[PDB]
């Protein structure tokens, strides 16, 4: 199932992912927090999954939220780095899904991250072309949930 | 405390960590798997914690083990990238510790990774000086467990 989803990562899609990551991934703390605070603002219900982080309204100043946000970006760094070898991409995505499946996060839930990604990309001047590419990468993860 | 342990990362320790990571982190898949297989070989009693991975003796051919090994290297990448800011290193270490605490991995059981690190380091012509530097970084995680 994950292999079939990975098949949608065409040469052009991988190129747009790598080009946009070159910018987004250069400030993992800043963009990681931006992603999370945007998720919480647009889909407040997702906060139910992050009780451990405490007062998420503090944003960057919240050490636990910052710690999670920075760490989240390294999962994406991992994915981007494995783009050229489907076998490696698949095994890392399945590994990544394990902990999220245990948390009972469905593919539909996970997909809520698409909006925030689109907004973060747009803040760096990366249009819909790039947003759609990222939606395809997220789809590979969804296929594993 | 983790705050006191993070203070032990002196200027030269951080430098030695970076210089060795430049080489070690160049092959996350190869060195990651080497790190895991070495751990399982020298401390077979730790295999019980990795039941989900299946037959670990298969090494690189085991998709689940390869996925875990590659992923483990991105946690180390994260730590190295945070060396400049003590505040960020600490929050990323505490975040990292959460999942390991819920697996009941003690500071003593985590420290068993020091052996494998020393051996992988030596296979790349990095001696005691570097092994001790990495032991100091591992000590930061141990303080959080
Ligand atoms: C681009 C998307 C995402 C990435 C790259 C990502 C990455 C990560 C990583 C690397 C971790 C730490 C390892 C682990 O425990 O699994 C994590 C933890 C977690 N993730 Fe995901 N995640 C994403 C989206 C989501 C979404 C949409 C939810 C739920 C609405 C979610 C909920 C969680 C929770 C609750 C934790 C534990 C937080 C804590 O208590 O420290 N994740 N995620
Ligand atoms: C250099 C030290 C280590 C690093 C960087 C590391 C990194 C990681 C990462 C990134 C994960 C995935 C996220 C998570 O669920 O926490 C993980 C999972 C795990 N770690 Fe650690 N770890 C290290 C040492 C250890 C040691 C020494 C043990 C046990 C003696 C351990 C046991 C586990 C287990 C059982 C899992 C889950 C494996 C699975 O079912 O996929 N880790 N670790």
């Amino acid at each position: 199932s994950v292999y079939d989803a990975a098949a949608q990562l065409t040469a052009d899609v991988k190129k747009d992912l790598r080009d946009s990551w070159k910018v987004i991934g250069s400030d993992k703390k800043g963009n990681g927090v931006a992603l999370m605070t945007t998720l919480f603002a647009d889909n407040q219900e997702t906060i139910g999954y992050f009780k451990r982080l405490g007062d998420v309204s503090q944003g960057m100043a919240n050490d636990k939220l910052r710690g999670h946000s920075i760490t989240l970006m390294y999962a994406l760094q991992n994915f981007i780095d494995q783009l050229d070898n489907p076998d490696d991409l698949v095994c890392v995505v399945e590994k990544f899904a394990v902990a999220h499946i245990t948390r009972k996060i469905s593919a539909a839930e996970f997909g809520k991250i698409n909006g925030p990604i689109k907004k973060v990309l747009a803040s760096k001047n990366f249009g819909d072309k790039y947003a759609n590419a990222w939606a395809k990468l997220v789809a590979v993860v969804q296929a594993a949930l």
Side-chain angles (χ1 to χ4, degrees), chain A:
Chain A
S1 184
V2 182
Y3 269 102
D4 282 23
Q8 305 302 290
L9 300 181
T10 64
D12 286 18
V13 171
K14 292 186 296 179
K15 175 59 178 173
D16 289 333
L17 284 176
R18 291 178 244 231
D19 284 344
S20 56
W21 184 246
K22 188 172 300 184
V23 177
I24 300 304
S26 63
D27 182 8
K28 295 188 175 60
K29 174 166 60 174
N31 295 317
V33 174
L35 275 173
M36 291 303 295
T37 55
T38 298
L39 174 69
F40 297 161
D42 299 336
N43 297 82
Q44 53 168 46
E45 70 272 18
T46 58
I47 296 178
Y49 292 103
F50 298 98
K51 182 178 63 180
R52 190 190 76 74
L53 304 189
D55 192 1
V56 296
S57 76
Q58 283 176 154
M60 180 72 77
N62 180 313
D63 300 321
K64 293 187 181 303
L65 176 59
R66 193 172 69 260
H68 169 71
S69 300
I70 295 172
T71 301
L72 173 152
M73 297 301 275
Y74 283 97
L76 295 177
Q77 178 69 60
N78 190 341
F79 300 159
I80 294 299
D81 286 347
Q82 316 314 320
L83 287 178
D84 293 315
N85 191 318
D87 296 321
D88 288 334
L89 174 61
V90 172
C91 79
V92 165
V93 167
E94 300 203 309
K95 158 67 180 184
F96 167 96
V98 171
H100 288 78
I101 291 175
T102 299
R103 298 187 181 98
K104 308 208 186 309
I105 295 169
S106 65
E109 276 306 304
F110 198 87
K112 294 180 179 182
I113 197 67
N114 279 148
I117 292 179
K118 183 179 188 177
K119 293 189 172 73
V120 170
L121 280 171
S123 69
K124 298 302 172 300
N125 299 309
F126 285 105
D128 304 330
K129 167 184 164 68
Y130 293 94
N132 295 316
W134 276 90
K136 293 179 174 301
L137 181 59
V138 170
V140 179
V141 177
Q142 288 178 295
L145 299 174

